A paper describes a structure:
Type IIS restriction endonucleases (the topic of this study) combine independently folded target recognition (‘TRD’) and endonuclease (‘EN’) domains within a single protein chain, cleaving DNA at one or both sides of their target site. Here, we report biochemical analyses and high-resolution crystallographic and CryoEM structures (in the presence and absence of bound DNA) of the Type IIS REase PaqCI. It forms a tetramer in solution in both the absence and presence of bound DNA, recognizes a longer target than FokI (5′-CACCTGC-3′), and cleaves each strand of bound DNA much closer to the bound target site (4 and 8 bases downstream, respectively). The enzyme displays a similar tetrameric organization of target recognition domains in the absence or presence of bound substrate, with a significant repositioning of endonuclease domains in a trapped DNA-bound complex that is poised to deliver the first of a series of double-strand breaks.
Author numbering:
A (entry chain B), C (entry chain B): 3 to 265, 272 to 308, 312 to 322, 333 to 459, 467 to 510
B (entry chain A), D (entry chain A): 2 to 163, 168 to 327, 333 to 459, 469 to 510
Write the structure that this text describes.
């Protein structure tokens, strides 16, 4: 909705203010030579109380970062939002963040001095100096930087000096928008995993699935005491989330046929559709991978030794652990699964759409996922930045980036495209501070995602426009979920 | 999803195309006309209470004949309950005097696999009115300029229930707001007067100043001065609201003063009303100022000894011909504009009471800083986008323009300073004309009585299109971020 | 909520008006000697478009009834409700009802003449004379008859003369409140059936359950061609609802152990808890029923002939068909299942409460069912009538019905209770017209239901009060479901 | 479920009992007092903006010392988000000046198994304020007069953060509305004046009639007459709203007229204000009528030649001692009543602006027939039931009464005409006194400064209890059907 983007706009402005004035987050003593700041979303793997954003402060010469959790309040929430924010800021410090920033309207109808009030309470009662307060006047949504010059610091913060272990700089997200690990998971996999969780919630007495005798025999050799299901699904707990993982993994991905190592490579296909609908995905085989290489490995290794190979090429156990981490991460980031593991209303809704309209590759399913990526994945923020920056360039000069064609007439080329994408990128990293550094790659993950979901056109670029955004499609995504 | 009204407009356009492709959808075999064209438009507020989602007008080889079909559109979000509403709504529309009615409803719901057949069956079994058609639709393609093209099928045709005019009615799907006379503040003050009078219909009456009452009695010896100076004859609720609003807020005692006379010299008083201009710069003016120099022209003809003071009063109340409107003519035209806009914004009932939306507008003006506040401007913009149907208009312009420039980004341009292409004012007029031809001949969402000035000025003022009127590769630059805010508001 | 009870109050008043004036539903010709009218809920087995109520008109000497479907509108719905009502009235006639009655506010803020408007449209366009229009002024909720004298007929109806086949008088409900068939179904059964429907919606490829070899062999003799599962679950379609029935029946009630006829009686128990939580319920055995009687029947009948007996004592097939009809009826009446068979939001919610708070016998589960019976089962109407009638009797004379005790002091006895219950009953049948005729039984089903759910106290009666209603408990039930 | 406020009251009562059973919940080992009693009450509107769900007052063996704990109650319906709100709310309460704060939150949520431990941990780790206690609860038993008895456990105690008064503050959980001076119409007109002034703070000022301005100048030669006759000195927003409301609606020019003099004869004018009486019979009266015969007493002392006209004006503005309130004394007491009720109904901000609820009340009066309409009466009744906390009061009376009569239906009765039991006025006073002893000593929801007249009259007038004051076997007969409507309204 509107709230997610506005928090992103304010987080960008906070990051800019700390770069302009490091004394907002540092005491007079310990002022560093150079600090950089950048805003990002909060990774779902962090604790329950979710922040509106994170601002990372990096120091010159170090490899560590100090992270500030951001809480953003709108007037529509009313003055009750102030007391929510104070509690949330204490929650963010309890979670382990070096600081927290409360960003709230400069005045309300009821209250002339809301930020002064929040500052007073923090000063009088809390005694935590790691919580900053910022107040704002209404943002300019025509700008690339809607909150530029419209946010003042009413209370600075100081990072708690009793911090011996500092956060690594390469940790955490580097953009405000969510990067999906674009290889292992699919729309169909989210659908089936939620389906298994709905199945297990209705029949907790469900019998564990049975492995083939050759597989169960092989597990006996490598892990003589271990339970074979726990072994090949790489689980140790019996919690709800791990059990659903077990059924999902053995039912949908590592099916009996896929767990067949050789026939020679068997050419097995899983039961999980690729997003492109052409076929079902493949696990451990297809090129010269595990099954095909082990077939070649048997030119000499024994037949029994092949099972040890199956369980820098990931085996069944290693892939099961990484794939579990992916689907767990993504489902939480999309807010489709509770921390406890039950499906949320949104997770149930996506599952319902898939069940009603022909599965995870249906238009209704693709459209609901896209709407989730726009709101919950914060691609609305990203689209706003690309739009306002592009409009600013092209309103000034509609022929920007074009190159002389045969007659001298301008044409927007692939070189034009790459120059324009690089300008957008340095603008996002240096001016807006909405992304950080850890090539025709600049925005490949974002643009492929956006194009696949219909938010940017199959034509990658057009003269006078840049990335041709299907804004009506984005408008529709913004409207969903009531 | 998109806007409910916009989806209704997309369906009305597709229905109008379907009637042109197959006139047997609304005509019996013997009733086949020589040539039939159809177009979709909004329903005028002046029509009955049960408001239709749209109107489709059918013209034949006849010269002055038009046949109107009232359209009701249902969304799955309304649920299976909407189907029964639509049957009742369709009967309401025929009762209002429409020749036919069309129900446009989803092909399936989660609850019910066969909704349109249900409506056809119920109409066949019980209603016995053959003037109601049923159309079923699959989800629209919002990528297209014509989202329902080929996605709507007729499940039940209609037959026209047996004088009619063709030059009558609105000619666009989007509403034309009457430019020049009314403002947000006027809508607000008028709704406040109607709410005050609704609670206290008896006690108040306005007081004219004595010189004016003496002047009216000499101009119109028998007429009641209030009825005279407000140009009213009825005693209906809506008329009394007008009388109070006119004298309380616009033709106030100061504004009704034709001239100031000091020591043989006549001068226009410089009166200002109590109604803010939309731009917030000052209060608005009547009979004086930059639009109407009536008082200044009268004072100059008194100072030159061309006219008596008695003749001056005649000119003030009666106007000066060419061009300069008098009090009575201004009151009557102002009453007609403000009545029309308030009904079309659906802020007022036919009875004259504020609607829920009029109440919501009034409350925003009262609490958040008046009719020129950001909250009031946002509420009006949302109303124009939704109730005025500019969401459908913006979609048409966007898709039609994207279709041109995606194929050729230099479309319409002309050789400029370096020889380089330039999108000029000529380019704009060529592009606007192509948009007109598509809107009337391909989409069938407008008909002939060239510019789009009224629409674009309104959209520009509420921030939905850019302050620059055109850009190369784009045409009219639409601010969809602003459009999102208006769509989400829910009036 | 408030709407359900108000429709019941208006339906009672409509039934009273037709008794006072049969010309409201009969033309001048064909005026009958004597007609009686009574209001009831609409049985869930009737079509999708559900009426707010039914009013039954019975004629003297006949065994047939003419039924009027009632649609009630509130001002809070606004004038849009009028056009809804016209369409609904046409829907009710299409469903096969002899007449329909639209009951709407006498005026709205917007509209001075709403009932005149509805009458005009019906007259001008519809041409159906079987639809009546009634208008009302605000009801008096202190009265036993809140709409008494406050409803006028703006448009009468006439029953379509082209009706050769008349509805039987013994058909349909005889009360405004829902009677649950108080023997075969339980809270646990609704819970498990919804659970099976949630299971099957997630895995439609689910394998059919397997019968014991002796059972499958026996089915081969009685129904040589029939599929044994379809045979013992007594199903013929393959629709969603019938399949969920099959899994539910074989998983939960006719389990493998319960399907064991003999060991002698086996003493099998099902997997469905009784509402009292003491044990699981029993099917076909326990007294001298099917299993025990067939054991006695084998004193002579063959062992093979016993299977024919198993499949006026209902067998497996006969009980499966009647029990299916019960659970189908009740779930639809509670609005927990769509006509298509998918669980509704309320059905899912009840299932969720049972899953989260310890099952169908939990307080949260009992409380949600009770809240459903108060609103969806319309026991709010019934409680209002008992309350206002009782208060009227006892406010007049607080010692009403008491009998002289040892000292002459009044005591409210069991005879006092039965006299008071009978007065309430004739008042409900003769004055309010909210129940019909097809003993210490007067309200046994309603009171047992109400007491079990905590709406009336375990003490059945008290002096000065009558049925002691726990009105605070009813208030809480009225508030749920947002 | 029940009402959110009622559940908060049930928890405050149980907290107060828990402190009496274990004073170590709020006192350090060295801070153990001689004897401690605790009671729950509402928080007075005169306290700061962040309003608590309740107050628990602790009295020690000290004579004038009271220690107040601000209570915040969270429901599962508020979700895991309410936990963080409560931490912030608790800090707000200590900042307001309370000695301690208590968070009362569910033992589990669907999302989170261990909510109260979360709050304890966060407070321990970051806040560093030991004056905030955390209590966890299992679902309440609404069958009981004490629904949380034994169902609330202390997860974190508090220690009182280091003058204090004991005779201060409200003495009941339910709010006492000040009877006699204000009406629904007064609340409505006052909110309208504040909304008008909020939009136009500059332009308006009220005009006193000339005789009164001359009289004030002679009585108070230096004082500004408006400040004098409205008994104000400040220029705050709330004060200006008072001045306009007083002169526009109550002490109108007619009502400010002390006498009418015709041919040597003095008479009370028979003025009526512009504020309706609650019963709708007439407009209300000031200084005249059935409550105050001040004008009649002055006119009778003029006619008897006991006093001058100058002395008559002194008596009118200054009152007559016994008993008869003058203009200034009436203005000051009326201002204090209306300010208190509006703040306690939460219809006005401390700043003087209408709240969302004040706006909702005003809109209902404006659109649905004024402050005495069924919709306005229903909105007020819902406010008293919810914001005034009479839902908890009714639950206490109901359960306490049911407990008595279920054991003995003839409880309190006395031998009547036939020898048969009768529930008499003596029975009622005995039963009311037992209710008092339970409310103060068992439930701890009221404390000593006998009748319940203020509460019962209010409840009776809004239809929540019966017009007959008592009935055998019942006590006070409660109309739970009416109570349902009020609970469902959501202000």
């Amino acid at each position: 909705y509107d709230h997610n983007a506005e928090a992103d706009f304010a987080a960008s402005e906070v990051a800019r203010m700390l770069v302009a004035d490091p004394g907002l987050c540092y005491d007079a003593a310990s002022l560093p030579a150079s600090i950089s700041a950048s805003a990002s979303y909060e990774p779902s793997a962090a604790g329950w109380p979710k922040a509106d954003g994170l601002v990372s402060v990096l120091e010159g010469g170090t490899s560590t970062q100090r992270a500030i959790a951001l809480e953003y309040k709108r007037p529509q929430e009313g003055i009750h939002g102030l007391l929510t924010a104070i509690g949330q800021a204490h929650g963010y410090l309890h979670k382990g963040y070096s600081g927290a920033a409360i960003v709230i309207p400069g005045r309300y109808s009821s209250h002339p001095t809301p930020a002064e009030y929040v500052r007073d309470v923090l000063n009088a009662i809390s005694g935590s100096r790691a919580i900053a307060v910022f107040s704002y006047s209404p943002p300019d949504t025509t700008s690339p930087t809607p909150f530029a010059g419209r946010i003042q610091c009413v209370r600075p913060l100081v990072f708690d000096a009793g911090r011996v272990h500092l956060r690594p700089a390469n940790q955490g997200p580097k953009t405000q928008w969510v990067h999906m690990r674009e290889g292992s998971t699919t729309r169909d996999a989210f659908f089936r995993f939620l389906q298994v969780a709905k199945r297990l919630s209705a029949d907790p007495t469900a019998p564990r699935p049975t492995l083939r005798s050759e597989l169960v025999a092989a597990i006996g050799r490598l892990a003589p005491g271990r339970d074979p299901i726990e072994y090949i699904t790489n689980t140790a707990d019996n919690k709800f989330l791990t059990k659903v993982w077990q059924f999902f993994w053995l039912e949908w991905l590592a099916t009996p046929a896929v767990l067949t190592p050789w026939k020679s490579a068997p050419g097995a296909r899983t039961r999980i559709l690729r997003e492109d609908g052409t076929d079902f995905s493949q696990l451990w085989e297809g090129r010269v991978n595990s099954l095909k290489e082990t077939i070649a490995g048997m030119l000499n290794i024994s037949e029994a030794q092949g099972w040890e190979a199956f369980v820098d090429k990931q085996g069944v156990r290693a892939r099961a652990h990484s794939y579990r981490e992916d689907i767990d991460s993504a489902l939480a980031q999309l807010r489709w699964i509770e921390d406890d593991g039950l499906p949320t209303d949104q997770g149930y809704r996506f599952m319902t759409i898939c069940e009603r309209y022909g599965g995870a590759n249906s238009r209704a399913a693709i459209d609901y996922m896209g709407a989730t990526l726009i709101q919950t994945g914060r691609y609305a923020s990203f689209l706003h930045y690309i739009n306002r920056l592009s409009e600013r360039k092209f309103a000034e000069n509609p022929l920007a980036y074009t190159k002389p064609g045969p007659g001298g007439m301008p044409v927007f080329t692939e070189e034009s495209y790459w120059e324009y994408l690089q300008d957008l990128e340095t603008k996002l990293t240096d001016e807006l501070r909405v992304m950080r550094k850890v090539v025709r790659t600049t925005f490949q993950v974002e643009l492929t995602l956006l194009r696949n979901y219909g938010f940017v056109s199959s034509t990658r670029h057009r003269l006078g426009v840049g990335i041709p955004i299907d804004w009506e499609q984005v408008v529709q995504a913004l409207n969903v979920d009531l």
